[PDB]
Tab-separated table of C-alpha atoms and ligand atoms in Angstrom:
chain	number	residue	atom	x	y	z
A	2	UNK	CA	-28.689	41.940	-40.679
A	3	UNK	CA	-32.056	43.632	-41.227
A	4	UNK	CA	-32.935	45.284	-44.542
A	5	UNK	CA	-33.177	49.088	-44.879
A	6	UNK	CA	-36.745	50.336	-45.509
A	7	UNK	CA	-37.799	51.148	-49.046
A	8	UNK	CA	-39.290	54.596	-49.441
A	9	UNK	CA	-41.381	55.852	-52.300
A	10	UNK	CA	-42.030	59.603	-52.551
A	11	UNK	CA	-45.594	60.387	-53.672
A	12	UNK	CA	-45.713	63.813	-55.307
A	13	UNK	CA	-48.270	65.798	-57.241
A	14	UNK	CA	-50.350	68.925	-56.857
A	15	UNK	CA	-53.081	69.883	-54.348
A	16	UNK	CA	-55.909	67.393	-54.792
A	17	UNK	CA	-54.141	65.149	-57.329
A	18	UNK	CA	-55.148	62.220	-55.164
A	19	UNK	CA	-51.972	61.343	-53.292
A	20	UNK	CA	-53.662	60.575	-49.940
A	21	UNK	CA	-56.504	58.721	-51.633
A	22	UNK	CA	-54.154	56.360	-53.454
A	23	UNK	CA	-51.727	55.865	-50.535
A	24	UNK	CA	-54.669	54.573	-48.494
A	25	UNK	CA	-55.286	51.918	-51.144
A	26	UNK	CA	-51.591	50.940	-51.058
A	27	UNK	CA	-51.581	50.607	-47.242
A	28	UNK	CA	-54.616	48.356	-47.545
A	29	UNK	CA	-53.260	46.066	-50.254
A	30	UNK	CA	-49.521	46.147	-49.525
A	31	UNK	CA	-49.221	46.980	-45.831
A	32	UNK	CA	-46.862	49.922	-46.286
A	33	UNK	CA	-46.883	52.789	-43.794
A	34	UNK	CA	-48.366	55.993	-45.158
A	35	UNK	CA	-46.718	59.189	-43.908
A	36	UNK	CA	-48.424	62.381	-45.111
A	37	UNK	CA	-45.856	65.138	-44.381
A	38	UNK	CA	-48.625	67.755	-44.434
A	39	UNK	CA	-50.582	65.847	-41.806
A	40	UNK	CA	-47.489	65.205	-39.675
A	41	UNK	CA	-46.824	68.946	-39.717
A	42	UNK	CA	-50.436	69.681	-38.753
A	43	UNK	CA	-50.087	67.272	-35.859
A	44	UNK	CA	-46.901	69.020	-34.748
A	45	UNK	CA	-48.789	72.311	-34.814
A	46	UNK	CA	-51.835	71.005	-32.885
A	47	UNK	CA	-49.577	69.743	-30.170
A	48	UNK	CA	-47.315	72.488	-28.849
A	49	UNK	CA	-43.845	72.861	-30.294
A	50	UNK	CA	-42.659	76.434	-30.871
A	51	UNK	CA	-42.478	75.384	-34.495
A	52	UNK	CA	-46.253	75.402	-34.607
A	53	UNK	CA	-47.538	78.801	-35.724
A	54	UNK	CA	-44.519	79.038	-37.985
A	55	UNK	CA	-46.070	75.856	-39.350
A	56	UNK	CA	-49.570	77.324	-39.138
A	57	UNK	CA	-48.761	80.363	-41.248
A	58	UNK	CA	-46.447	78.837	-43.813
A	59	UNK	CA	-49.090	76.155	-44.429
A	60	UNK	CA	-51.779	78.835	-44.919
A	61	UNK	CA	-49.762	80.787	-47.477
A	62	UNK	CA	-48.843	77.637	-49.379
A	63	UNK	CA	-45.183	77.786	-48.353
A	64	UNK	CA	-42.774	74.927	-47.659
A	65	UNK	CA	-41.671	74.524	-44.039
A	66	UNK	CA	-37.843	74.203	-43.586
A	67	UNK	CA	-36.580	70.624	-43.628
A	68	UNK	CA	-35.175	70.895	-40.141
A	69	UNK	CA	-38.789	70.485	-38.956
A	70	UNK	CA	-40.196	68.085	-41.546
A	71	UNK	CA	-37.284	65.691	-41.935
A	72	UNK	CA	-37.333	65.241	-38.156
A	73	UNK	CA	-41.022	64.402	-38.121
A	74	UNK	CA	-40.471	61.868	-40.896
A	75	UNK	CA	-37.388	60.299	-39.366
A	76	UNK	CA	-39.231	59.827	-36.022
A	77	UNK	CA	-42.131	57.958	-37.584
A	78	UNK	CA	-39.659	55.941	-39.688
A	79	UNK	CA	-37.595	55.100	-36.593
A	80	UNK	CA	-40.680	53.954	-34.706
A	81	UNK	CA	-41.649	51.600	-37.534
A	82	UNK	CA	-38.688	49.309	-38.036
A	83	UNK	CA	-39.765	46.501	-40.340
A	84	UNK	CA	-42.015	48.615	-42.591
A	85	UNK	CA	-41.642	50.212	-45.999
A	86	UNK	CA	-42.801	53.798	-46.247
A	87	UNK	CA	-44.973	55.925	-48.511
A	88	UNK	CA	-43.858	59.497	-47.883
A	89	UNK	CA	-46.562	61.692	-49.311
A	90	UNK	CA	-46.119	65.334	-50.296
A	91	UNK	CA	-42.368	65.321	-49.726
A	92	UNK	CA	-39.948	66.549	-50.970
A	93	UNK	CA	-41.552	69.782	-52.059
A	94	UNK	CA	-38.299	71.646	-52.275
A	95	UNK	CA	-34.729	71.318	-53.436
A	96	UNK	CA	-33.690	72.175	-49.892
A	97	UNK	CA	-36.052	69.536	-48.427
A	98	UNK	CA	-34.602	66.962	-50.843
A	99	UNK	CA	-30.938	67.756	-50.087
A	100	UNK	CA	-31.728	67.425	-46.397
A	101	UNK	CA	-33.378	64.054	-47.053
A	102	UNK	CA	-30.352	62.869	-49.019
A	103	UNK	CA	-27.830	63.928	-46.398
A	104	UNK	CA	-29.693	62.775	-43.302
A	105	UNK	CA	-31.486	59.635	-44.525
A	106	UNK	CA	-29.275	57.893	-47.112
A	107	UNK	CA	-27.731	55.710	-44.399
A	108	UNK	CA	-31.136	54.758	-42.988
A	109	UNK	CA	-33.490	53.981	-45.862
A	110	UNK	CA	-33.209	53.261	-49.565
A	111	UNK	CA	-35.397	55.629	-51.568
A	112	UNK	CA	-36.727	53.809	-54.581
A	113	UNK	CA	-38.736	56.120	-56.856
A	114	UNK	CA	-40.980	59.186	-56.984
A	115	UNK	CA	-44.607	58.294	-57.779
A	116	UNK	CA	-45.988	61.351	-59.624
A	117	UNK	CA	-49.735	61.782	-60.008
A	118	UNK	CA	-50.044	64.006	-63.033
A	119	UNK	CA	-53.285	65.987	-63.050
A	120	UNK	CA	-54.695	69.174	-64.719
A	121	UNK	CA	-55.053	72.151	-62.431
A	122	UNK	CA	-58.656	72.603	-63.372
A	123	UNK	CA	-59.593	69.152	-62.127
A	124	UNK	CA	-57.576	69.416	-58.911
A	125	UNK	CA	-59.378	72.737	-58.249
A	126	UNK	CA	-62.797	71.213	-58.688
A	127	UNK	CA	-61.856	68.180	-56.523
A	128	UNK	CA	-60.827	70.487	-53.697
A	129	UNK	CA	-63.727	72.955	-53.921
A	130	UNK	CA	-66.039	69.949	-53.828
A	131	UNK	CA	-64.272	68.704	-50.705
A	132	UNK	CA	-64.650	71.942	-48.750
A	133	UNK	CA	-68.266	72.262	-49.919
A	134	UNK	CA	-68.797	69.498	-47.376
A	135	UNK	CA	-66.455	71.344	-44.998
A	136	UNK	CA	-63.479	69.036	-45.193
A	137	UNK	CA	-60.635	71.524	-44.704
A	138	UNK	CA	-60.276	75.344	-44.532
A	139	UNK	CA	-57.306	75.095	-46.908
A	140	UNK	CA	-59.969	74.225	-49.442
A	141	UNK	CA	-60.697	77.680	-50.821
A	142	UNK	CA	-59.553	79.379	-53.987
A	143	UNK	CA	-56.941	81.684	-52.501
A	144	UNK	CA	-55.109	78.733	-50.936
A	145	UNK	CA	-55.428	76.363	-53.873
A	146	UNK	CA	-53.890	78.964	-56.217
A	147	UNK	CA	-50.975	79.687	-53.849
A	148	UNK	CA	-50.187	75.987	-53.657
A	149	UNK	CA	-50.343	75.750	-57.446
A	150	UNK	CA	-47.589	78.376	-57.693
A	151	UNK	CA	-45.352	76.727	-55.078
A	152	UNK	CA	-45.772	73.397	-56.821
A	153	UNK	CA	-45.064	74.995	-60.200
A	154	UNK	CA	-42.061	77.020	-59.144
A	155	UNK	CA	-40.411	74.742	-56.628
A	156	UNK	CA	-41.550	71.184	-56.810
A	157	UNK	CA	-41.622	70.641	-60.544
A	158	UNK	CA	-37.824	71.064	-60.319
A	159	UNK	CA	-37.409	68.233	-57.794
A	160	UNK	CA	-39.422	65.991	-60.076
A	161	UNK	CA	-37.204	66.321	-63.138
A	162	UNK	CA	-34.103	66.129	-61.050
A	163	UNK	CA	-35.318	62.650	-60.095
A	164	UNK	CA	-36.223	62.131	-63.711
A	165	UNK	CA	-32.539	62.634	-64.698
A	166	UNK	CA	-31.867	59.320	-62.976
A	167	UNK	CA	-34.973	57.656	-64.378
A	168	UNK	CA	-36.524	57.764	-60.899
A	169	UNK	CA	-40.021	59.119	-61.617
A	170	UNK	CA	-43.019	56.875	-62.301
A	171	UNK	CA	-45.829	58.940	-63.776
A	172	UNK	CA	-49.462	57.918	-63.314
A	173	UNK	CA	-52.093	60.227	-64.881
A	174	UNK	CA	-54.633	60.967	-62.148
A	175	UNK	CA	-57.359	62.526	-64.309
A	176	UNK	CA	-59.428	59.346	-64.159
A	177	UNK	CA	-61.709	57.634	-61.695
A	178	UNK	CA	-60.041	56.409	-58.478
A	179	UNK	CA	-60.339	52.772	-59.496
A	180	UNK	CA	-58.839	53.459	-62.894
A	181	UNK	CA	-55.930	55.234	-61.256
A	182	UNK	CA	-55.450	52.613	-58.539
A	183	UNK	CA	-55.299	49.730	-60.991
A	184	UNK	CA	-52.181	51.331	-62.444
A	185	UNK	CA	-50.756	51.959	-58.945
A	186	UNK	CA	-51.286	48.370	-57.822
A	187	UNK	CA	-49.838	46.952	-61.021
A	188	UNK	CA	-46.767	49.167	-60.686
A	189	UNK	CA	-46.123	48.100	-57.088
A	190	UNK	CA	-46.625	44.497	-58.140
A	191	UNK	CA	-44.085	44.836	-60.944
A	192	UNK	CA	-41.580	46.556	-58.663
A	193	UNK	CA	-41.696	43.298	-56.737
A	194	UNK	CA	-43.646	44.614	-53.737
B	1	UP5	N1	-59.369	60.013	-58.969
B	1	UP5	C1	-60.110	60.887	-58.308
B	1	UP5	N2	-61.206	61.410	-58.920
B	1	UP5	C2	-61.962	62.279	-58.238
B	1	UP5	N3	-61.843	62.626	-56.963
B	1	UP5	C3	-60.719	62.140	-56.426
B	1	UP5	C4	-59.821	61.336	-57.015
B	1	UP5	N4	-58.729	61.098	-56.178
B	1	UP5	C5	-59.037	61.771	-55.135
B	1	UP5	N5	-60.230	62.470	-55.235
B	1	UP5	C6	-60.810	63.459	-54.341
B	1	UP5	O1	-60.026	64.602	-54.423
B	1	UP5	C7	-60.055	65.260	-53.158
B	1	UP5	C8	-58.617	65.445	-52.822
B	1	UP5	O2	-58.023	64.140	-52.665
B	1	UP5	P1	-56.750	63.780	-51.813
B	1	UP5	O3	-56.503	62.371	-51.993
B	1	UP5	O4	-56.905	64.229	-50.474
B	1	UP5	O5	-55.537	64.580	-52.500
B	1	UP5	P2	-54.071	65.093	-52.139
B	1	UP5	O6	-53.211	65.009	-53.295
B	1	UP5	O7	-53.593	64.389	-50.952
B	1	UP5	O8	-54.279	66.599	-51.762
B	1	UP5	P3	-54.301	67.511	-50.466
B	1	UP5	O9	-55.625	68.014	-50.267
B	1	UP5	O10	-53.703	66.798	-49.343
B	1	UP5	O11	-53.358	68.721	-50.855
B	1	UP5	P4	-51.877	69.143	-50.720
B	1	UP5	O12	-51.007	68.145	-51.370
B	1	UP5	O13	-51.789	70.508	-51.190
B	1	UP5	O14	-51.629	69.160	-49.129
B	1	UP5	P5	-50.672	68.557	-48.031
B	1	UP5	O15	-51.468	68.104	-46.911
B	1	UP5	O16	-49.801	67.579	-48.632
B	1	UP5	O17	-49.800	69.815	-47.537
B	1	UP5	C9	-50.383	71.081	-47.139
B	1	UP5	C10	-49.296	72.087	-46.905
B	1	UP5	O18	-48.418	71.472	-46.007
B	1	UP5	C11	-47.134	72.092	-46.217
B	1	UP5	N6	-46.197	71.031	-46.379
B	1	UP5	C12	-46.473	69.652	-46.700
B	1	UP5	C13	-45.444	68.780	-46.734
B	1	UP5	C14	-44.141	69.095	-46.524
B	1	UP5	O19	-43.063	68.280	-46.676
B	1	UP5	N7	-43.895	70.386	-46.208
B	1	UP5	C15	-44.904	71.251	-46.098
B	1	UP5	O20	-44.557	72.506	-45.744
B	1	UP5	C16	-47.266	73.021	-47.443
B	1	UP5	O21	-47.474	74.350	-47.058
B	1	UP5	C17	-48.459	72.417	-48.122
B	1	UP5	O22	-49.098	73.304	-48.982
B	1	UP5	C18	-60.770	64.366	-52.168
B	1	UP5	O23	-62.058	64.834	-51.916
B	1	UP5	C19	-60.781	63.044	-52.877
B	1	UP5	O24	-61.890	62.282	-52.546
B	2	MG	MG1	-52.903	64.756	-48.835
């Protein structure tokens, strides 16, 4: 009857430019952008009894259990029948990914991982610049470095799992936004979107 939603995972390190590029894709393609980090922050800022577990894990650079995050994602997905979805910053974890694959296979068809490859030194500067005009409080050195380790230890393994099935599109993000987005747009255009 109706087609299953296409989902594209957008992965990459802290400040690689995931949210910046997903905003350009929403604009030009009309996909729904779901930042899993933001959805979790919104679950914390409302009550929940998962908040505070969410507060502290987020602050140490840890990955919240999928039983929270996959629910938040599935709810937004359910509410937006008719859309395709950019899920940003997920999956961070082998456990998050297995949960995705066992709870969401029947619902959506997950197309590829879009990986913004970026040097740590540039992501660090991008983030320290952002907090220097008081964007976030996550935007200090202790937090950035913790997230670097979680990315390096846990989420680089998800990426080359998906690369075993030729399911990772890599876009080097160490350029100007417009240089990076031209590649993004052209990819989405060639994928038939
Ligand atoms: N090409 C470019 N050149 C120069 N500047 C560029 C640029 N692109 C962007 N900027 C500039 O870079 C800064 C960061 O950008 P942004 O687009 O915001 O980057 P992004 O990759 O989205 O980085 P973000 O700051 O969101 O970091 P994280 O990916 O670390 O954070 P997230 O919000 O995804 O998650 C935070 C925490 O949530 C938790 N989490 C998140 C998801 C989940 O499934 N589970 C979960 O537990 C984890 O603890 C995680 O550490 C901005 O000032 C921007 O203007
Ligand atoms: Mg983001």
